[PDB]
């Protein structure tokens, strides 16, 4: 396949411009009915997992004849302030759906409901049965990549071959996840992209489905993105700093993470502060 544009220069918004943009983002969240978030490799860099096309990204370092650096294992990695902010946003009903390109499995481990999440490129902790399609969320990473047999069998008897959910460059996106991600993105009046370069299709094109129906588009990234020209608001800064300032404006606290936990279905929305005039 193609690695795309790697190691592009990073842009940083000054403290004055950044503060005004987070308030503009807060206004867009309060006024929107269907908010869909789009996450990429950048929202995991603050946890010790490198991105792909950033200054020290996997494909950027490969081009330089160097190896990417991991400051953690996927099992010892803890969800960032951004992952936990997204958990709270969903809990208070301010987040309708979450579309992710990340294989790190941090969204599931943070306690985010799996029925409001589309894992387009898979999850390295999730293995699927080839016969009944039943998914298994493991506490450790699945040893195989490229939808290959792991060795373990189904327990629902079915006894079907369990395969990884990691897609190779040539593999097609999962039908259920892509259909739900496309439906949510199309029907959203606000799509916010966090830590994604938006260079890989159809994943990168999903936030544009919002823009096609008069819906608003917000892009939060350090480097420039493929669809920068069609964003209503472009925030250049660290996703953790942007989300921390956002939660403060919304009057929401970032919840504590008490270790890896799996939530299959979303609960009814928890009480949230009243909306400003
Ligand atoms: C293997 C596979 O099947 N698919 C992978 C991956 O799933 C897919 C998606 O790419 P993405 O998720 O956008 O990573 P990025 O291109 O490196 O884009 C990440 C973006 O995050 C930005 N970024 C990094 N840290 C950030 C931070 N703390 N705050 C804000 N932005 C950040 C960075 O500038 C980069 O532009 O590309 C494929 O190689
Ligand atoms: Zn099975």
């Amino acid at each position: 396949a193609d690695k795309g544009k790697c190691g592009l220069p990073e842009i940083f918004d000054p403290p004055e411009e950044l503060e005004r943009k987070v308030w503009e983002l807060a206004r867009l969240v309060w006024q929107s009915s269907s908010v869909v978030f789009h996450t990429g490799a950048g929202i995991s860099t603050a946890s010790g997992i490198p991105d792909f096309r950033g200054p020290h990204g996997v494909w950027t370092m490969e081009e330089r004849g160097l190896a990417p650096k991991f400051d953690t294992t996927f099992e010892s990695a803890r969800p960032t302030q951004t992952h936990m902010a997204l958990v709270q946003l969903e809990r208070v009903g301010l987040l309708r759906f979450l579309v992710s390109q990340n294989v790190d499995g941090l969204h599931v481990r943070s306690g985010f409901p799996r029925d409001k999440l589309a894992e387009l490129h898979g999850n390295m902790f999730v293995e699927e049965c080839a016969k009944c399609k039943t998914q298994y969320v493991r506490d450790t990473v699945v040893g195989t990549m490229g939808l290959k047999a792991t060795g373990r069998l189904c327990t629902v008897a079915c006894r079907g071959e369990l395969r990884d959910t990691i897609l190779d460059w040539e593999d097609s996106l999962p039908d259920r996840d892509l259909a739900l991600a496309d439906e949510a993105s199309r029907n959203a009046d606000l799509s916010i992209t966090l830590g994604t370069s938006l260079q890989i299709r159809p994943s990168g094109n999903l936030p544009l489905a919002t823009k096609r129906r008069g819906g608003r588009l917000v892009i939060v990234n350090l480097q420039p993105t493929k669809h920068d020209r069609h964003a209503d608001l472009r925030i250049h800064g660290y996703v953790d700093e942007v989300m921390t300032r956002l939660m403060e404006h919304l009057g929401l606290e970032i919840p504590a993470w008490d270790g890896p936990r799996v939530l299959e279905r979303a609960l009814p929305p928890l009480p949230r502060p009243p909306t400003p005039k």
Side-chain angles (χ1 to χ4, degrees), residues 1-2 4-15 17-19 21-61 63 65-74 76-115 117-130 132 134-147 149-152 154-155 157-158 160-172 174-182 184-198 200 202-225 227-233 235-244 246-247 249-252 254-257 259-260 262-264 266-271 273-276:
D2 202 305
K5 203 73 190 69
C6 296
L8 284 155
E10 290 189 321
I11 312 150
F12 303 92
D13 285 324
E17 198 178 291
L18 194 78
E19 271 285 344
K21 282 177 182 185
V22 180
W23 269 109
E24 189 75 81
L25 173 61
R27 188 197 71 94
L28 285 151
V29 171
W30 283 313
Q31 282 190 316
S32 299
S33 302
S34 188
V35 182
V36 176
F37 276 87
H38 303 260
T39 61
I43 71 146
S44 294
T45 57
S47 266
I49 305 161
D51 58 20
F52 294 91
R53 298 167 187 92
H56 287 196
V58 177
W59 306 138
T60 307
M61 294 312 276
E63 280 183 354
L66 293 147
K69 170 65 181 148
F70 283 83
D71 304 295
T72 186
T73 55
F74 293 98
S76 68
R78 68 152 287 127
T80 62
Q81 289 166 295
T82 294
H83 285 94
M84 297 314 293
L86 296 164
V87 166
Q88 190 77 296
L89 285 170
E90 187 287 316
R91 284 197 191 153
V92 299
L94 282 170
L95 191 160
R96 164 62 178 79
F97 205 77
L98 174 62
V99 182
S100 194
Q101 293 177 73
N102 295 336
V103 295
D104 55 44
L106 293 163
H107 284 305
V108 301
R109 282 159 85 82
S110 72
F112 193 94
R114 295 189 75 229
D115 69 338
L117 169 72
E119 302 200 276
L120 303 177
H121 302 156
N123 189 318
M124 61 221 308
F125 292 87
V126 173
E127 59 184 356
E128 199 173 291
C129 173
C132 68
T134 306
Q135 291 186 310
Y136 294 80
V137 189
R138 306 286 173 182
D139 63 352
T140 56
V141 294
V142 164
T144 60
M145 283 185 132
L147 314 168
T150 69
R152 283 167 291 282
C154 199
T155 60
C158 179
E161 191 172 277
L162 301 179
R163 285 167 175 171
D164 66 86
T165 52
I166 303 308
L167 301 172
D168 207 285
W169 287 103
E170 55 237 70
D171 287 307
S172 204
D175 298 352
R176 189 193 164 256
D177 296 83
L178 187 62
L180 289 162
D182 191 64
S185 302
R186 273 163 23 205
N187 291 291
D189 54 348
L190 182 69
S191 270
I192 306 155
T193 85
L194 307 174
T196 180
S197 69
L198 300 158
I200 293 300
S203 307
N205 296 334
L206 292 166
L208 294 174
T210 302
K211 201 72 202 83
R212 247 117 292 271
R213 286 178 206 185
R216 302 283 218 197
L217 174 62
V218 181
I219 294 169
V220 184
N221 212 56
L222 287 166
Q223 279 179 337
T225 72
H227 315 301
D228 270 353
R229 69 188 191 200
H230 255 289
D232 296 84
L233 187 72
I235 309 162
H236 284 96
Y238 296 100
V239 284
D240 277 359
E241 203 207 327
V242 172
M243 295 303 279
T244 48
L246 179 65
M247 298 306 268
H249 297 339
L250 302 165
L252 301 164
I254 296 161
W257 185 70
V262 186
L263 180 66
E264 285 294 316
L267 290 152
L270 283 176
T275 303

